[PDB]
Amino acid sequence: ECRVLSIQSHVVRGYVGNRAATFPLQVLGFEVDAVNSVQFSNHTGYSHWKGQVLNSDELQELYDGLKLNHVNQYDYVLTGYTRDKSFLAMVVDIVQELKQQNPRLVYVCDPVMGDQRNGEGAMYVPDDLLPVYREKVVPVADIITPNQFEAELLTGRKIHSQEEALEVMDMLHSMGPDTVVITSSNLLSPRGSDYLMALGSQRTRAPDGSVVTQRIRMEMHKVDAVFVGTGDLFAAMLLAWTHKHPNNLKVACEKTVSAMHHVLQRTIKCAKAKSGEGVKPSPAQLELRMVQSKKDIESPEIVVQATVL
Amino acid sequence: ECRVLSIQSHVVRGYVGNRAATFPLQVLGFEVDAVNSVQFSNHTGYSHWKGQVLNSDELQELYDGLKLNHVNQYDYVLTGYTRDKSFLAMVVDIVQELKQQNPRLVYVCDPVMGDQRNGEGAMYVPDDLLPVYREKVVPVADIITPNQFEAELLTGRKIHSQEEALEVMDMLHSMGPDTVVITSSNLLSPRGSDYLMALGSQRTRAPDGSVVTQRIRMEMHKVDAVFVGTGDLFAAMLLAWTHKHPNNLKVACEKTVSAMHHVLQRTIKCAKAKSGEGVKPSPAQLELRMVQSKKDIESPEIVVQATVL
Ligand SMILES: Nc1ncnc2c1ncn2[C@@H]1O[C@H](COP(=O)(O)OP(=O)(O)CP(=O)(O)O)[C@@H](O)[C@H]1O
Ligand SMILES: Nc1ncnc2c1ncn2[C@@H]1O[C@H](COP(=O)(O)OP(=O)(O)CP(=O)(O)O)[C@@H](O)[C@H]1O
Ligand SMILES: Cc1ncc(CO)c(CN)c1O
Ligand SMILES: Cc1ncc(CO)c(CN)c1O
Ligand SMILES: [K+]
Ligand SMILES: [K+]
Ligand SMILES: [Zn+2]
Ligand SMILES: [Zn+2]
């Protein structure tokens, strides 16, 4: 009984968008209904790319489809990278109707807007999207996973310290989502530039109306390469694991990251093993070795440690 | 090193076409590049259905895509149900260019045209397709899996006996494919109406230019229900297994069928378990329990026996 309505992009080759969130969620037993928001030959990181996009009407046509056949009832709804403002809107209407359809509907949303680097950040999607995510989308999500950049954008506040971070996540919680995980930061991790720091924070409702707030910090070993898709693979698995541990933003993230590691490490290798001695791996060689990593996606060898508060 | 270019239909919900051939081929480690020939909400067997189709030009646009990025090199190419004559054509041009690209390119083709029943058969695709499959498509395929009906149509000859069958398969081999498996027949199996007979035949080239021809017969236990997708799931796995046993149309089919059984039996059950005591299962309940059957798709418990000649 695990149905997910993943609305994301599809590529014929490679792993990005729905191609990066389906296989996982399936080997881990989730019945994944996937709506391809676009179908391109490969991700836009390649030199060339040809494909088509689904517009707001078309997306609609499909929703209705599932309606007419009374099968528009899901547990989780997962979304990520979108370029059309109008499209994203539609997606909200849907998630809405869909929630009245099932109270315990968890909307896992990766507010994809852009990347940063010490301040030198910038959106890679139209700016007319920031308003929707902030005003329409985020308000209804129940689990968001933004960048440092992305979280800074939504909150309109820049992060300088870890404490400021935890306070930017609180501003998020006060936006709707009871789960917020800043998948990666520029903050120097207490273990050196070699690592990558990530921050998580979950809000639970106390039996007396009070507040309970767990917080964590996982430092992952960085990998020297430009990877396309990790944003999607992460959100998927997080959704998976946070289902097994409905109340352990700590336990989940641990598994979620560990696998991310296993995948990336096997990826970079096979990738490097195809350009050995003197050449930078092409984006066509850095694609995620998903299939080859199934073994880990299911039985993740926890090789990280969540630190509370 | 297992890349497949599966050109088939996609549904948001359910398992038919590419949704029925991808998950399998992946859990069994094949890097599957999937081109969705159409994207509908659910298969056309439901009361309603809404969706869009990819035309010949659009399909082209994607091929080129993989071209410009020099990644148009696959091992296997898998196709099935197509409704557009023009579309199928395109698909041949591609498979062609693609074969010059890699000699050992195996084109696995399921010549989907229609179903039969003692003679009362009829195509469920435009008749303007029979000519292409017979003249253009089949000539280039290296592994076809037709119906009794479908094989009768291609050969233009009706099957009455088992011997006539083996002779209809020979007429196929003489069309191109060195592998032909009539996935199911009306021929009474030597074990009663309760079973389903299927026939396989592989042509190998002898080291002296002579002829070697293995032949088999597997009787599978029938299941009392109308299942959509089994045609696709079969072709996938056959492609999988006939890769491990490049020369044992016997060994392969055994595994291919066994799993088909496991899937169908678990499917019918969960399906029946949702309409218990007095109601016929809806097509919305008969969908294939794919995810739930991964365990078998990989470790198929051989519960059948291939009979040579
Ligand atoms: N070069 C790298 N080294 C280590 N981990 C990396 C990595 N690239 C990605 N990751 C992993 O991917 C996850 C999310 O990555 P990140 O926070 O960079 O994504 P993002 O939101 O910028 C996504 P994208 O840019 O791909 O859309 C983290 O768990 C992180 O460990
Ligand atoms: N009702 C049933 N009972 C037993 N096996 C069945 C079945 N329906 C399908 N199968 C299995 O599916 C495989 C192919 O089925 P079949 O020959 O009926 O397909 P087909 O080419 O008519 C496909 P479709 O009509 O679904 O496109 C066989 O291996 C067969 O065992
Ligand atoms: C088409 C497409 N989809 C999804 C992503 C990332 O989630 C990328 C890479 N920007 C992409 O090019
Ligand atoms: C859209 C679609 N694709 C594929 C198939 C069978 O391979 C069906 C069922 N006819 C279907 O409706
Ligand atoms: K993120
Ligand atoms: K068939
Ligand atoms: Zn991202
Ligand atoms: Zn068929």
XYZ file of C-alpha atoms and ligand atoms in Angstrom:
708
model
C 0.000 0.000 0.000
C 2.576 2.561 -1.070
C 1.448 4.765 -3.914
C 3.371 7.842 -5.002
C 2.405 10.337 -7.686
C 5.765 11.509 -8.966
C 5.427 14.427 -11.350
C 8.820 14.986 -12.912
C 10.824 15.121 -16.093
C 11.810 12.062 -18.066
C 14.831 11.490 -20.308
C 15.247 8.631 -22.742
C 18.833 8.171 -21.585
C 20.352 8.923 -18.255
C 19.050 9.524 -14.768
C 17.494 12.819 -13.891
C 13.999 13.712 -12.699
C 11.502 10.792 -12.755
C 14.170 8.460 -14.091
C 16.092 9.126 -10.890
C 13.198 8.770 -8.489
C 11.311 5.789 -9.886
C 13.749 2.876 -9.929
C 14.696 3.568 -6.308
C 11.161 3.976 -4.961
C 10.355 0.747 -6.770
C 13.176 -1.528 -5.558
C 12.081 -0.314 -2.121
C 8.539 -1.504 -2.953
C 6.696 1.827 -3.631
C 4.041 1.612 -6.333
C 5.172 4.621 -8.336
C 2.802 6.329 -10.719
C 5.007 8.589 -12.824
C 3.863 11.586 -14.868
C 6.615 12.809 -17.188
C 6.543 16.617 -17.116
C 8.856 16.518 -20.171
C 10.542 13.905 -22.396
C 14.012 14.836 -23.666
C 16.740 12.650 -24.996
C 19.208 13.422 -22.193
C 19.539 16.010 -19.453
C 20.274 19.577 -20.526
C 23.836 19.239 -19.270
C 24.919 17.473 -22.440
C 26.178 19.488 -25.389
C 22.924 18.900 -27.250
C 19.403 17.883 -26.228
C 16.144 17.425 -28.068
C 12.752 16.811 -26.626
C 9.210 17.996 -25.823
C 7.525 19.454 -22.747
C 4.129 18.841 -21.298
C 2.092 22.002 -20.878
C -0.418 22.816 -18.160
C -3.384 21.579 -20.195
C -1.741 18.267 -21.051
C -0.828 17.666 -17.433
C -4.470 18.325 -16.673
C -5.729 15.838 -19.243
C -3.859 13.130 -17.368
C -5.031 14.122 -13.930
C -8.631 13.863 -15.119
C -7.773 10.520 -16.581
C -7.064 9.102 -13.176
C -10.151 10.872 -11.981
C -12.654 9.374 -14.348
C -11.366 5.946 -13.323
C -11.480 6.647 -9.560
C -7.834 5.924 -8.944
C -6.772 9.432 -8.042
C -5.956 8.417 -4.488
C -2.302 8.430 -3.409
C -0.272 8.355 -0.191
C 2.642 10.531 -1.328
C 2.990 13.074 -4.118
C 6.511 13.912 -5.233
C 7.644 16.906 -7.327
C 10.899 18.562 -8.259
C 12.318 20.581 -11.153
C 9.736 22.563 -13.124
C 10.352 25.430 -15.500
C 6.778 26.603 -16.208
C 5.100 28.754 -13.554
C 1.703 27.845 -14.905
C 2.569 24.172 -14.757
C 3.589 24.311 -11.111
C 0.287 25.990 -10.308
C -1.720 23.163 -11.801
C 0.357 20.798 -9.698
C -0.864 22.551 -6.582
C -4.545 22.349 -7.436
C -3.962 18.629 -7.877
C -2.067 17.996 -4.669
C -4.903 19.906 -3.006
C -7.829 17.897 -4.342
C -5.659 14.880 -3.679
C -5.237 15.713 0.009
C -8.954 15.999 0.661
C -8.992 12.615 -1.000
C -6.546 11.293 1.639
C -5.732 13.185 4.846
C -2.449 11.372 5.494
C -1.209 12.633 2.118
C 2.416 13.652 2.370
C 3.576 16.091 -0.274
C 7.334 15.717 -0.731
C 8.607 18.819 -2.501
C 12.116 19.730 -3.723
C 11.881 23.487 -4.381
C 14.311 23.465 -7.256
C 15.342 27.046 -8.122
C 19.116 27.270 -8.362
C 22.611 26.717 -6.986
C 24.955 28.879 -4.920
C 28.609 29.177 -3.934
C 29.657 31.550 -1.138
C 27.073 34.047 -2.332
C 27.676 33.701 -6.051
C 24.339 32.010 -6.595
C 21.616 32.577 -9.176
C 18.434 30.838 -10.259
C 18.484 28.544 -13.275
C 14.715 28.712 -13.610
C 12.566 31.795 -14.351
C 12.350 34.157 -11.355
C 8.586 34.225 -11.718
C 8.739 30.921 -9.808
C 10.111 32.130 -6.504
C 6.730 33.745 -5.737
C 4.725 30.556 -6.337
C 6.946 28.275 -4.324
C 7.040 30.775 -1.486
C 3.322 31.715 -1.660
C 1.523 28.719 -3.189
C 3.676 25.574 -3.254
C 5.711 25.495 -0.023
C 2.627 26.320 2.080
C 1.169 22.924 1.164
C 4.322 20.738 1.163
C 4.971 18.467 4.124
C 8.635 17.639 3.411
C 10.916 20.066 1.569
C 14.612 19.613 0.719
C 16.120 22.952 -0.392
C 19.631 24.125 -1.148
C 21.289 26.617 1.106
C 20.631 29.001 -1.724
C 17.078 27.824 -2.227
C 16.292 28.035 1.486
C 17.854 31.470 1.606
C 15.570 32.511 -1.269
C 12.366 31.243 0.219
C 13.045 32.803 3.623
C 14.653 35.834 2.092
C 17.400 35.441 4.659
C 21.116 34.727 4.217
C 22.858 32.042 6.272
C 26.211 32.771 7.942
C 26.330 30.437 10.900
C 24.921 27.078 11.845
C 22.671 28.789 14.307
C 21.366 31.100 11.638
C 20.710 27.951 9.643
C 18.592 26.310 12.297
C 16.739 29.606 12.403
C 16.163 29.610 8.673
C 14.740 26.128 8.951
C 12.415 27.320 11.695
C 11.165 30.037 9.374
C 10.452 27.202 6.966
C 8.503 25.095 9.436
C 6.464 28.235 10.044
C 5.628 28.073 6.370
C 4.077 24.639 6.493
C 6.462 21.696 6.100
C 7.076 19.710 9.295
C 10.179 18.335 7.679
C 12.996 20.438 6.241
C 16.382 19.164 5.163
C 18.949 21.486 3.711
C 20.674 18.838 1.664
C 24.013 20.729 1.618
C 25.713 23.925 2.849
C 28.717 26.186 2.472
C 29.158 26.145 6.214
C 32.504 24.689 7.113
C 31.875 21.271 8.635
C 33.654 20.449 11.914
C 35.714 17.994 9.868
C 37.261 20.048 7.082
C 36.650 21.315 3.579
C 36.750 17.652 2.501
C 33.278 17.118 3.803
C 29.813 18.504 3.066
C 27.437 19.575 5.826
C 23.689 19.065 5.597
C 20.999 20.115 8.063
C 17.692 18.542 9.068
C 14.821 19.612 11.314
C 11.476 17.959 12.093
C 8.465 19.471 13.873
C 6.213 17.098 15.827
C 2.963 18.071 17.620
C 3.007 17.442 21.379
C 0.042 15.774 23.141
C -0.511 19.047 25.014
C -0.353 21.418 22.044
C 3.265 22.234 22.848
C 6.315 22.055 20.601
C 8.825 19.292 19.997
C 11.614 19.888 17.480
C 14.332 17.385 16.611
C 17.352 18.698 14.719
C 20.324 17.011 13.066
C 23.551 17.425 11.152
C 25.211 14.949 8.867
C 28.563 15.544 7.306
C 29.063 13.571 4.137
C 32.353 12.981 2.450
C 32.492 15.180 -0.657
C 33.260 13.787 -4.132
C 35.187 15.923 -6.626
C 32.767 16.050 -9.555
C 29.699 17.770 -11.054
C 26.749 15.420 -10.693
C 23.359 15.951 -12.302
C 20.420 14.133 -10.669
C 21.520 13.783 -7.054
C 18.876 16.284 -6.092
C 16.173 13.965 -7.387
C 17.676 10.696 -6.089
C 17.895 12.236 -2.667
C 14.286 13.411 -2.439
C 13.127 10.007 -3.598
C 14.963 7.944 -1.001
C 14.306 10.471 1.745
C 10.627 9.908 0.977
C 11.239 6.181 1.098
C 13.117 6.095 4.379
C 11.016 8.707 6.127
C 8.148 6.272 5.645
C 9.835 3.485 7.574
C 10.869 5.906 10.300
C 7.862 8.268 10.371
C 9.416 9.933 13.415
C 13.179 9.861 13.100
C 14.427 12.541 10.757
C 17.693 11.255 12.205
C 17.427 7.573 11.291
C 16.074 8.319 7.837
C 18.602 10.898 6.687
C 21.283 8.507 7.776
C 20.173 5.848 5.327
C 19.267 8.404 2.632
C 22.784 9.890 2.679
C 24.658 6.614 3.062
C 23.205 5.311 -0.197
C 23.726 8.612 -1.910
C 27.344 7.963 -1.052
C 27.429 4.409 -2.342
C 25.847 5.514 -5.609
C 28.121 8.489 -6.121
C 31.270 6.596 -5.267
C 30.481 3.743 -7.658
C 29.410 6.309 -10.202
C 32.521 8.462 -10.059
C 34.616 5.327 -10.319
C 33.056 3.690 -13.371
C 33.016 7.242 -14.689
C 36.690 7.846 -14.005
C 37.519 4.354 -15.145
C 36.436 5.481 -18.599
C 38.824 8.471 -18.910
C 41.736 7.231 -16.802
C 45.088 9.040 -16.842
C 44.562 12.720 -17.836
C 40.908 13.480 -18.859
C 37.982 15.102 -17.063
C 34.924 12.794 -17.127
C 32.189 13.942 -19.522
C 28.583 14.453 -18.278
C 27.795 11.459 -20.471
C 30.093 9.365 -18.259
C 29.021 10.847 -14.964
C 25.390 9.675 -15.325
C 24.312 7.821 -12.210
C 25.055 4.093 -12.115
C 21.580 3.380 -10.776
C 20.979 -0.158 -11.903
C 24.447 -1.133 -10.754
C 23.684 0.286 -7.323
C 20.368 -1.346 -6.586
C 22.156 -3.531 -4.037
C 22.804 -0.444 -1.935
C 19.594 1.492 -2.484
C 17.825 -1.282 -0.624
C 20.452 -2.383 1.913
C 22.276 0.925 2.558
C 25.417 0.433 4.599
C 25.087 3.318 6.999
C 28.455 5.020 6.696
C 27.513 8.350 8.311
C 26.239 9.643 11.660
C 23.460 12.104 12.413
C 24.247 14.588 15.164
C 21.211 15.937 17.010
C 20.844 19.682 17.605
C 27.343 -3.367 -20.322
C 23.683 -4.044 -21.021
C 21.939 -1.257 -22.868
C 18.461 -1.631 -24.320
C 16.531 0.908 -26.367
C 12.941 0.135 -25.461
C 10.497 2.053 -27.621
C 7.064 1.562 -26.122
C 4.036 3.206 -24.614
C 3.972 4.665 -21.137
C 1.057 5.053 -18.723
C 1.062 7.179 -15.600
C -0.647 4.378 -13.692
C -0.477 0.689 -14.262
C 1.826 -1.652 -16.114
C 1.633 -1.906 -19.848
C 4.201 -1.188 -22.555
C 7.441 0.440 -21.284
C 6.131 0.412 -17.732
C 6.001 -3.369 -18.006
C 9.387 -3.868 -19.603
C 11.576 -1.413 -17.711
C 11.361 -2.362 -14.040
C 12.106 -5.995 -14.897
C 15.029 -5.341 -17.242
C 16.389 -3.074 -14.529
C 16.187 -5.349 -11.465
C 18.001 -7.815 -13.726
C 20.696 -5.153 -14.277
C 19.926 -3.941 -17.868
C 20.579 -0.247 -18.435
C 17.245 0.574 -20.031
C 16.854 3.664 -22.157
C 13.106 4.087 -22.572
C 11.352 6.126 -25.261
C 7.654 6.547 -24.486
C 5.760 6.155 -27.768
C 2.699 7.556 -25.936
C 1.789 8.821 -22.444
C -1.749 8.006 -21.283
C -3.174 7.928 -17.826
C -3.936 4.192 -17.843
C -4.175 1.444 -20.433
C -7.069 1.627 -22.885
C -8.777 -1.257 -21.113
C -10.166 1.041 -18.443
C -13.536 2.695 -18.941
C -11.858 6.023 -19.655
C -8.362 7.085 -20.718
C -6.739 10.384 -21.549
C -3.337 10.983 -22.976
C -1.078 12.027 -25.874
C 0.847 10.151 -28.557
C 4.254 10.746 -29.989
C 4.245 11.142 -33.752
C 6.908 10.061 -36.218
C 8.636 13.449 -36.205
C 8.789 13.642 -32.418
C 10.228 10.155 -32.194
C 12.809 11.339 -34.686
C 13.729 14.415 -32.670
C 14.741 12.114 -29.837
C 16.726 9.708 -31.947
C 18.804 12.614 -33.245
C 19.226 13.732 -29.692
C 21.128 10.610 -28.831
C 22.956 11.029 -32.084
C 24.333 14.484 -31.555
C 25.713 13.276 -28.223
C 27.266 10.073 -29.636
C 25.387 7.724 -27.367
C 23.260 6.068 -30.008
C 24.951 2.726 -29.468
C 22.910 -0.091 -27.912
C 23.098 -3.870 -27.508
C 19.369 -4.630 -27.702
C 16.440 -2.689 -29.126
C 12.993 -3.653 -27.892
C 9.619 -2.754 -29.457
C 6.021 -3.815 -29.084
C 2.564 -2.291 -29.519
C 2.381 0.533 -32.064
C -0.701 1.953 -33.716
C 0.849 4.298 -36.314
C 2.203 2.709 -39.496
C 4.397 5.709 -40.110
C 5.771 5.489 -36.599
C 6.765 1.850 -36.957
C 8.599 2.723 -40.157
C 10.746 5.307 -38.436
C 11.547 2.671 -35.839
C 13.013 0.490 -38.555
C 15.281 3.149 -40.008
C 16.590 3.579 -36.476
C 17.158 -0.068 -35.662
C 18.965 -0.190 -39.005
C 21.408 2.659 -38.458
C 21.778 1.260 -34.972
C 22.851 -2.171 -36.219
C 25.627 -0.820 -38.409
C 26.601 0.936 -35.219
C 26.862 -2.447 -33.437
C 26.874 -5.775 -35.295
C 25.832 -7.856 -32.283
C 22.659 -5.757 -32.065
C 19.711 -7.954 -31.210
C 16.339 -6.548 -32.179
C 13.676 -8.076 -29.934
C 10.307 -7.536 -31.586
C 6.777 -8.410 -30.399
C 4.668 -8.093 -33.570
C 1.570 -6.913 -31.783
C -1.435 -7.060 -34.144
C -4.315 -8.839 -32.442
C -5.805 -11.771 -30.544
C -7.563 -14.951 -31.653
C -9.798 -17.717 -30.321
C -10.400 -20.864 -32.390
C -10.470 -18.749 -35.529
C -12.529 -15.872 -34.189
C -9.577 -13.512 -34.273
C -9.223 -9.960 -35.562
C -6.618 -7.219 -35.420
C -6.934 -4.463 -32.838
C -4.542 -2.236 -34.754
C -5.000 -0.789 -38.270
C -4.613 -3.448 -40.987
C -2.187 -1.189 -42.809
C 0.355 -2.571 -40.316
C 0.379 -6.206 -41.341
C 2.284 -5.256 -44.519
C 5.054 -3.396 -42.669
C 5.666 -6.039 -40.056
C 5.687 -8.738 -42.707
C 7.719 -6.749 -45.286
C 9.791 -4.227 -43.311
C 9.884 -4.986 -39.577
C 10.078 -8.779 -39.170
C 12.837 -9.041 -41.802
C 15.177 -7.178 -39.446
C 14.102 -8.605 -36.050
C 16.274 -11.235 -34.405
C 13.788 -12.455 -31.768
C 10.028 -12.312 -32.342
C 7.257 -13.467 -29.980
C 3.922 -13.630 -31.853
C 0.482 -14.927 -30.981
C -0.875 -17.942 -32.743
C -3.034 -15.429 -34.515
C -0.178 -13.041 -35.149
C 2.076 -15.805 -36.464
C -0.745 -17.051 -38.641
C -1.090 -13.523 -40.058
C 2.542 -12.999 -40.848
C 2.918 -16.392 -42.529
C -0.531 -16.221 -44.007
C -1.000 -19.790 -42.852
C -3.450 -21.277 -40.341
C -2.271 -23.667 -37.627
C -4.185 -26.899 -36.946
C -1.611 -29.246 -35.505
C 1.584 -28.991 -33.534
C 3.474 -30.077 -36.583
C 1.885 -27.356 -38.642
C 3.007 -25.017 -35.886
C 6.640 -26.011 -36.064
C 6.278 -25.456 -39.788
C 4.858 -21.991 -39.318
C 7.801 -21.150 -37.114
C 10.152 -22.386 -39.817
C 8.483 -20.030 -42.263
C 9.280 -17.341 -39.718
C 12.947 -18.221 -39.381
C 13.041 -17.981 -43.165
C 11.917 -14.411 -42.693
C 14.849 -13.378 -40.559
C 14.515 -13.999 -36.817
C 16.677 -16.840 -35.479
C 14.427 -16.947 -32.468
C 10.658 -17.394 -32.588
C 8.419 -18.116 -29.634
C 4.704 -18.442 -30.057
C 3.872 -17.345 -26.553
C 0.526 -19.224 -26.518
C -1.725 -21.462 -28.649
C -5.191 -22.921 -29.026
C -3.651 -26.323 -29.533
C -4.801 -28.684 -26.845
C -1.840 -29.319 -24.559
C -1.058 -32.948 -23.656
C -2.226 -32.045 -20.151
C -5.738 -30.682 -20.576
C -7.679 -27.513 -21.241
C -6.372 -26.297 -17.865
C -3.025 -25.546 -19.370
C -1.677 -23.253 -22.090
C 0.780 -24.465 -24.718
C 3.561 -22.272 -26.069
C 6.105 -23.069 -28.774
C 9.732 -22.051 -29.256
C 12.285 -22.569 -32.021
C 15.870 -21.332 -32.410
C 18.064 -21.424 -35.524
C 21.830 -21.683 -35.005
C 24.479 -21.609 -37.780
C 26.610 -24.763 -37.986
C 30.416 -24.556 -38.374
C 30.017 -26.175 -41.802
C 27.224 -23.965 -43.136
C 24.656 -26.607 -42.225
C 21.513 -26.268 -40.129
C 20.895 -26.792 -36.435
C 17.401 -26.163 -35.070
C 16.373 -26.596 -31.442
C 12.649 -26.686 -30.698
C 10.635 -26.665 -27.481
C 7.223 -26.758 -25.869
C 6.231 -25.441 -22.494
C 2.809 -25.917 -21.046
C 1.936 -23.295 -18.486
C -0.887 -23.517 -16.036
C -3.644 -21.164 -17.207
C -5.156 -18.479 -14.946
C -8.834 -17.569 -15.313
C -8.635 -13.837 -16.010
C -8.110 -11.137 -18.665
C -4.645 -9.683 -18.183
C -3.330 -6.606 -19.964
C 0.473 -6.290 -20.187
C 1.648 -9.896 -20.085
C 2.672 -9.580 -23.694
C 5.140 -6.852 -22.782
C 6.419 -8.419 -19.537
C 7.137 -11.586 -21.430
C 9.167 -10.018 -24.235
C 11.183 -8.102 -21.677
C 12.236 -11.061 -19.555
C 12.724 -13.296 -22.577
C 15.221 -10.677 -23.741
C 16.788 -10.737 -20.302
C 17.119 -14.491 -19.976
C 18.087 -15.135 -23.573
C 21.128 -12.999 -22.809
C 22.336 -15.245 -20.010
C 21.684 -18.330 -22.112
C 22.599 -17.055 -25.600
C 22.130 -20.608 -26.870
C 19.377 -22.289 -24.908
C 15.964 -21.208 -26.099
C 15.051 -24.011 -23.705
C 16.704 -22.741 -20.524
C 15.578 -19.178 -21.120
C 11.904 -19.764 -21.841
C 11.799 -21.851 -18.722
C 12.763 -18.939 -16.513
C 10.754 -16.427 -18.579
C 7.540 -18.438 -18.132
C 8.115 -19.421 -14.514
C 8.220 -15.774 -13.458
C 5.302 -14.909 -15.659
C 3.522 -17.455 -13.514
C 4.680 -16.061 -10.195
C 3.618 -12.572 -11.245
C 0.229 -13.607 -12.555
C -0.578 -15.786 -9.584
C 0.291 -13.070 -7.063
C -1.535 -10.602 -9.250
C -4.765 -12.548 -9.588
C -4.731 -13.114 -5.850
C -4.277 -9.555 -4.605
C -6.739 -8.758 -7.372
C -9.294 -11.307 -6.229
C -8.617 -10.432 -2.630
C -10.131 -7.046 -3.416
C -13.510 -8.312 -4.725
C -13.878 -11.496 -2.677
C -17.187 -13.379 -2.568
C -19.216 -12.617 -5.747
C -17.550 -9.923 -7.970
C -15.465 -10.083 -11.139
C -12.153 -8.217 -10.660
C -12.002 -4.873 -12.486
C -9.132 -4.104 -14.932
C -8.094 -1.544 -12.332
C -7.537 -4.413 -9.879
C -5.946 -6.797 -12.328
C -2.968 -4.489 -13.033
C 0.272 -6.394 -12.617
C 1.736 -6.501 -9.109
C 5.196 -5.762 -10.471
C 6.905 -4.152 -7.534
C 5.543 -6.835 -5.244
C 7.016 -9.488 -7.516
C 10.548 -8.233 -7.900
C 11.676 -11.114 -5.687
C 10.643 -13.534 -8.417
C 11.619 -11.586 -11.516
C 15.209 -11.978 -10.402
C 15.179 -15.391 -8.698
C 12.496 -17.205 -10.746
C 11.546 -20.523 -9.207
C 11.450 -22.668 -12.304
C 8.057 -24.325 -12.041
C 7.775 -25.529 -15.656
C 9.632 -27.833 -18.053
C 10.668 -27.267 -21.651
C 10.169 -30.251 -23.933
C 12.498 -30.370 -26.933
C 11.099 -31.046 -30.412
N 29.961 16.378 -5.400
C 29.294 15.827 -4.402
N 29.972 15.336 -3.313
C 29.293 14.777 -2.301
N 27.951 14.621 -2.200
C 27.293 15.127 -3.320
C 27.869 15.731 -4.432
N 26.930 16.117 -5.354
C 25.821 15.743 -4.784
N 25.956 15.141 -3.554
C 24.905 14.577 -2.655
O 23.610 14.859 -3.179
C 22.701 15.280 -2.141
C 22.050 16.572 -2.569
O 23.006 17.367 -3.262
P 22.954 18.918 -3.373
O 22.562 19.507 -2.073
O 24.192 19.374 -4.043
O 21.803 19.055 -4.407
P 21.089 20.182 -5.112
O 19.824 20.430 -4.398
O 21.968 21.302 -5.432
C 20.720 19.312 -6.454
P 21.016 19.503 -8.021
O 21.971 20.639 -8.182
O 21.657 18.219 -8.521
O 19.672 19.716 -8.576
C 23.494 15.346 -0.848
O 23.023 14.286 -0.024
C 24.903 15.175 -1.268
O 25.586 14.286 -0.408
N -4.809 -15.938 -18.499
C -3.568 -16.385 -18.560
N -3.256 -17.614 -18.032
C -1.995 -18.066 -18.094
N -0.924 -17.439 -18.637
C -1.273 -16.195 -19.162
C -2.534 -15.610 -19.168
N -2.527 -14.376 -19.768
C -1.277 -14.248 -20.107
N -0.457 -15.304 -19.779
C 1.012 -15.466 -19.996
O 1.517 -14.376 -20.761
C 2.441 -14.825 -21.773
C 2.018 -14.248 -23.101
O 0.596 -14.234 -23.168
P -0.228 -14.262 -24.488
O 0.376 -15.219 -25.443
O -1.660 -14.380 -24.135
O 0.003 -12.799 -24.957
P -0.427 -11.939 -26.119
O 0.680 -11.912 -27.093
O -1.782 -12.232 -26.577
C -0.371 -10.523 -25.290
P -1.443 -9.366 -24.990
O -2.781 -9.835 -25.456
O -1.469 -9.151 -23.486
O -0.883 -8.217 -25.715
C 2.483 -16.341 -21.703
O 3.767 -16.693 -21.200
C 1.380 -16.700 -20.785
O 1.783 -17.699 -19.870
C 15.392 17.886 -18.137
C 16.001 17.900 -16.747
N 15.261 17.434 -15.678
C 15.647 17.458 -14.334
C 16.910 17.998 -14.030
C 17.412 18.139 -12.569
O 16.463 17.671 -11.658
C 17.795 18.455 -15.119
C 19.110 18.982 -14.869
N 18.881 20.432 -14.741
C 17.298 18.423 -16.465
O 17.999 18.897 -17.517
C -1.601 2.301 -24.317
C -1.356 0.803 -24.313
N -0.073 0.325 -24.494
C 0.300 -1.019 -24.598
C -0.717 -1.986 -24.502
C -0.429 -3.500 -24.672
O 0.924 -3.735 -24.923
C -2.107 -1.566 -24.237
C -3.180 -2.512 -24.093
N -3.711 -2.642 -25.461
C -2.400 -0.162 -24.181
O -3.651 0.322 -24.027
K 17.659 19.859 -2.525
K 3.409 -12.320 -28.044
Zn 18.463 20.837 -6.490
Zn 0.401 -9.468 -27.680
